[PDB]
């Protein structure tokens, strides 16, 4: 099944979102905000 509560919590630090993985979350960072610029 695709819903539960086994997974991690990750959030943004540049618009604040909150993401269920953490390259879930680098895959938003690089896209929309690419701090290594
Ligand atoms: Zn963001």
Do not use: E, T
Not at 3 to 14: D, M, Y
Not at 20 to 37: E, F, G, T, Y
């Amino acid at each position: 099944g695709s819903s539960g509560s086994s997974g991690i919590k990750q959030h943004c630090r540049f618009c604040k979102k909150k993401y269920s993985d953490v390259k879930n979350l680098i895959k938003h960072i690089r896209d929309a905000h690419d701090p290594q610029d």
